[PDB]
Symmetry: D3
């Protein structure tokens, strides 16, 4: 029962992902391959990062995360394979996932394999890591890798060797911290009483609006449930709602809800209606909150 | 070899379904998770119902159906879990599904777990039920459920415990019939000789048109295969064809076929062309039929 | 550990695929069902063949390929089931898939089951076959098949039996070669010294442009890597670049790459930018290439 | 130098308007035909009234306003022709139009000729009338009018006669006030101290938002220039700004301006940027304003 | 008091029409320039013809029609200038236009000037002509015409000289009939009892549907006002209504009306709703009619 | 017979332009008002400039050009009224407009009145000017101008006083050169043998592609008709055609034509087909030409 959770930019409109899965079953016959999603904006490492950072706590320990967008495919670049440290609690409150008090996950229990292009930036900062390796061994990758399909050659193939029990430390040399590429994560700016950030994503298929203002940012300003907030979107939209746990707390259908989403971030929405879709609100718009 | 069949409004554009699956594999190591679909219109209980009602006869006995759109997520509402009575024949003819004479399914062989918001209305009407329970036991749900993710906390998680052998009767107290929420199903109206109903769904990806006029409505009007019919849509666009078993019976490509779809309902299409898409025909438009 | 790899025109918007899968697990409890894709243009047998021709070398031996668009559903037409001969190398170069030197596949190791409507044309061409059978036995298909769902009745259901070790030769009588329906794939012509083909596909989600001009057409025109090419699309949009192994060979982000794709065909792209989407480039547009 | 100012739902995509104009020049060789607009939503009598109510103070005395949407063309309905009383001041302030102190207009100086379908409702309200006649005389309309072109037959043709000095009282019998069809224009209500109206128009091509909240509603709520206002559109999008004379009062390009428009109504805009288009704001959406 | 009526494909999005007008006012100081329309599909001679054929009876005698789409601009081609014979009655009934009994127009009273590219095909068929000349004299056209602006050089300019009194016979040599280019007009075909033709135009801005089935085609089939008809469009969508003079005869708003439009052609609409726009009905679709 | 040629950003979808025209006929009863166009992108002074720079040679001397986009409406800014110097030849060759050798225009014969916002930048540089005045006199503008309608108050009103014969020098004080606001006109860059500029506009309704590379730029490189050119659009589209006078010179319909447009600028198009529309080519894309 080893598991590979597969997140790519290959789409679901042809056999690309299927080619990867075939090789995964060829290499690790008893594997379960779980699709994260294959629908990310290609080459957008910051977005792919979002789909992979919250994963470990939800999976049984020993799960391998094969995560890939590879614009540098067919170059001398090689992937990185990391064993993370903290599985890490998540959500609005910061807790373990599961029934009861949740399923506590041990440390050093998940492997991420990805292009060394910054895709694992937030995984590394939010979980830490115990070890990190360049993926170079002809035992886990092709000697002649397909120039335009490194998402298969350099992620999917070796992830299945790792899931079969190939020793992580044998995929290639240890990587020093600085050799692991990171993208810049823009910071939430304290601006007087206000916290100033950005709309980080539109929560599809609902049209909810997610910000990069985390619960840790809020509580450092002393903002918890009940706080009457002004959340200004796009510079000109001063929404006004108390912070509430969930959508229905806005009252009637269509009413504005300000809440902490399931990833732990300040968000805004309408109760059982779309906020973002009718007004064509977008990722990257400004987002400011204050009491 | 347990199965959970998972129908949600979570989409496939981020890791939401994957989080649910990870937890299901965590609780039930031997489980196969089968995706039904995740693309339904959020908060549309009637549409979600369409995707789940026809499923039992196709699945092995003991299958759990985890089915969720959750607009009341984070409120005091709790899920219902039901053991259905009859697996129920289906199709245009009413038969068991599978090779040969079909696979006959024993009574009481499927469980649905769902928000108690009306999603199971047509499940209960067409399959009946033997027992129904409120889902409240912290052995099957989180002690501290994520306010905005009840689809995972109150459906995916306890569905995996049920797959894993947790006694159905122990999830919570029994629910009496009037405690199970139901949506209203508009009836097919008789109008002299005409049967008057609705376009219930556009059949994607083909653009066939499905009505809520059932084969039983037709055979009580005396209408059977070979009958010449006038089927009028949106009030303005009429169509004339004999009633035929299939699309190619219309003759040339693009010719109007009027038929019974695989769910047992009167439908209209073009032979290997799209009907709905060029004329922008939509669900909710009226549908009138008469010999 | 039997595998069924499943390609259809059923979509992922309702329960259609799940109904097939449920019957697959019913017949073959052991089975792993792998989705290829379900998003193909309904009834486009050439597009469907594209999503299935390159699969075998990637999969474990014994894999059954359930591949289906069925616009003749409900007619006297019966499916064809074939055991292919060569797994066949693929790629820009022509190699076995996998780590190290790749994994060689024994001959006669895969079964395709599909409508006899030409969908397997390129599979048969590129792989050959050892045996081909009409699928008629009530042991593998329903005695009374659903008229509008032959993709389930005549492909999905019998594919699961074949995965379960049902003898291929026992599905029905042998089919002679002339009874296996084919489509004609237009040839790559020569206008003087230029190669005149077609855009065979837009490569989603990247927007890359794929032509029907194969490696072997290039090498018999004396076109090798490094050759400066003019490629004109749709008879008006000209593009110029060396033939290179990959996208990054183009240099700056956005620059034109002319390359061989992972399927072995002359393709054209922007480096980590979309070519097709901004210019609304389409499958079926002409592609001419000159040195 | 007679003038006919011409407003219709005829469009500018075929020869319809030119056919009317040709007949106008035929009857009144002297005439100047001025287009108001021909792009109104067909059959929307409220929108049409908007394009004609503010015209008189701008035009030379004696001007005939040929104003027409005619969804009842071809019926026994006959047009109404009225001589209005007050030319009426307009604008954000309420002034005469023109250079210096403006040009005063004598009373009873303009004729409107239109279908008796409510199109002149606001014209009659804001201008009053001295006389109103049914248009029936064969001297001014065709003996056998084109059934589908009453905008020409019953408005354009008789308007040219009236421009040519045909006696208004001789077009047909006097109409009593109750025989002149009106629409009801919804009032601006008061929810506590907030003013609750509607978006009356998107102001093309700028994308400005126009409400039905007039200067006089503002001044009887004690709202003057400089007052800080919260204006919410469609029940969810909030905007905040002082009431100012113009767009540039907002400051930076893109900043919210809340202002009185040239027609005298509370409006909202971005300064030299579009407000409506990015947010897909629409006529008919609710508008609430609070101090 | 001369008039030039100006129909072009120049659009109204820049100064192209204004340049033409300036020159027309320059040549003919006393002229009124009446815009017909400028929005026709460029290079569509058949569509351009529709906008000009019905015009003469509406205009004063001596009017010049300057009508131009010019794909052969800058070539050796030269315009044709024609004095038509009969002004021709029109409408659904066939009558003179105007008040009273209509304005009867004398023979030989209108000139059309146009590219000799077939634009005047239906002008000549319906009005006849008395004389036709090639436009070549440098007294009416530029000595050095702008290669890409023949609509101005070879139509607008000489149209103004003709308005200004330049002898028609002096523009260039006479053109014999076979020297005047004609487009082919597909005939209305008889098919048993049905009349089979085409959707000739969508009637913008309303979305009414116009066919090329003339009233004469109807009255030779015995069809008159009150006849119950089945009118089928695009082959698939049929419609049933009596033939009525106008829209409101269909009864309720949105009801199907089948009528004769103001150009004398069989048409189909909804009563004060759009037919074409919701169902995306287009010009070129087939149209079949029968009692 | 005085003429006002009116170019605004007011659109044609309401009565805005009509309000201006009414005041024009009120102030100058014998005026002819010619519409240039009212469809420019609001506040885009560089585009408005394009619609007004080529005008004078086409109009009779003494014509007044009322040209306006006024984002600074309701501020202390006042318009500028200029008498230009050279009427200026135009077109592919640089010639006078009209029949024969064209209509030669005297110097000092046209007045432009516009916002002092840079709209007259190219008018001034291509025609020069003899005098320039601030428009401030209450004899030609309102004492209380409508804050949001300066296109009427500050352009349309005083243009009609000027057309009536109000002395230009009496509208307000003389303006020094530096007080006349100019926008930056980016230069065509000589880059080796290449001329490097930009796509200046899409020529609607055709989809022709206009560049800012003028005939004077070309001939300074020695490029005339016949020159085999490479015109690279958008960095990646190396079109190849000889420079020819007109579209048809490309040969068959759809073929690429490179030519000098009627404004004197290097352009590219297809013969009687659209270049820009199918490929979504846009203003502001790079444009490079070379031999
Ligand atoms: C939000 N869904 C979780 C996935 C989400 N992308 C996340 O990562 O938190 C869970 C459930 O919330 C419900 N939901 C989502 N948005 C709303 C909303 N605005 N109002 C009411 N219910 C909502 C949906 O029915 C869905 O089943
Ligand atoms: C209709 N498909 C079943 C899924 C469908 N949503 C259902 O629930 O019945 C099965 C097969 O019917 C074929 N089909 C669907 N619509 C048409 C049509 N209009 N004409 C011809 N074939 C069709 C498709 O190729 C598909 O493989
Ligand atoms: C191309 N992908 C393979 C699937 C493809 N449909 C095929 O069948 O070859 C593999 C990787 O190539 C990368 N890729 C695709 N297109 C481009 C491009 N135009 N520029 C740079 N990288 C690209 C993607 O990030 C993806 O991870
Ligand atoms: C608003 N225009 C008047 C027509 C308007 N439809 C009305 O009836 O008031 C006049 C001038 O105001 C300017 N204008 C319009 N909207 C804006 C805006 N949002 N910001 C700055 N200027 C604007 C335009 O450039 C135009 O020349
Ligand atoms: C180009 N038209 C002039 C207006 C243009 N906006 C200009 O300012 O030069 C003049 C005539 O050229 C013809 N024309 C324009 N573009 C093409 C083309 N690409 N191919 C053939 N004819 C064309 C049209 O029919 C039109 O009547
Ligand atoms: C149809 N209009 C004539 C122009 C038309 N393009 C023609 O050439 O006949 C005249 C009047 O008929 C009315 N009209 C047009 N279509 C409809 C319709 N479908 N229902 C009711 N009234 C209509 C319009 O309001 C318009 O003012
Ligand atoms: Cl929604
Ligand atoms: Cl958008
Ligand atoms: Cl237990
Ligand atoms: Cl739509
Ligand atoms: Cl059969
Ligand atoms: Cl498109
Ligand atoms: Cl009548
Ligand atoms: Cl919209
Ligand atoms: Cl003369
Ligand atoms: Cl369309
Ligand atoms: Cl076009
Ligand atoms: Cl676009």
């Amino acid at each position: 029962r080893p598991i590979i959770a597969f997140m790519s930019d290959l789409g679901t409109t042809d056999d690309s992902v299927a080619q990867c899965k075939g090789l995964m079953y060829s290499i690790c016959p008893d594997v379960t391959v779980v699709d994260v999603c294959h629908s990310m904006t290609p080459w957008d490492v910051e977005e792919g990062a979002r789909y992979i950072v919250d994963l470990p706590r939800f999976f049984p320990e020993g799960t391998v995360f094969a995560t890939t967008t590879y614009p540098a495919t067919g170059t001398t670049t090689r992937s990185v394979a990391v064993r993370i440290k903290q599985a890490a609690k998540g959500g609005a409150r910061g807790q373990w996932a599961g029934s009861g008090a949740g399923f506590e996950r041990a440390e050093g229990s998940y492997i991420y394999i990805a292009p060394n292009n910054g895709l694992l930036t937030t995984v590394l900062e939010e979980h830490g890591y115990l070890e990190a390796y360049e993926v170079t061994s002809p035992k886990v990758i092709p000697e002649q890798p397909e120039p335009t399909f490194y998402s298969r050659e350099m992620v999917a193939i070796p992830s299945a060797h790792l899931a079969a029990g190939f020793p992580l430390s044998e995929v290639g040399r240890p990587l020093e911290d600085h050799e692991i590429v990171r993208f810049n994560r823009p910071a939430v700016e304290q601006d007087g009483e206000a916290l100033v950030g950005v709309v980080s994503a539109i929560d599809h298929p609902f049209g909810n609006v997610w910000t990069n203002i985390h619960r840790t940012d809020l509580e450092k300003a002393g903002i918890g449930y009940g706080a009457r907030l002004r959340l200004t979107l796009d510079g000109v939209l001063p929404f006004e709602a108390p912070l509430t746990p969930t959508f229905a707390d806005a009252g009637e259908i269509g009413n504005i809800a300000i809440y902490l989403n399931s990833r732990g971030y300040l968000s805004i929405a309408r109760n059982a209606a779309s906020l973002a879709y009718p007004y064509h609100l977008k990722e990257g718009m400004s987002a400011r909150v204050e009491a």
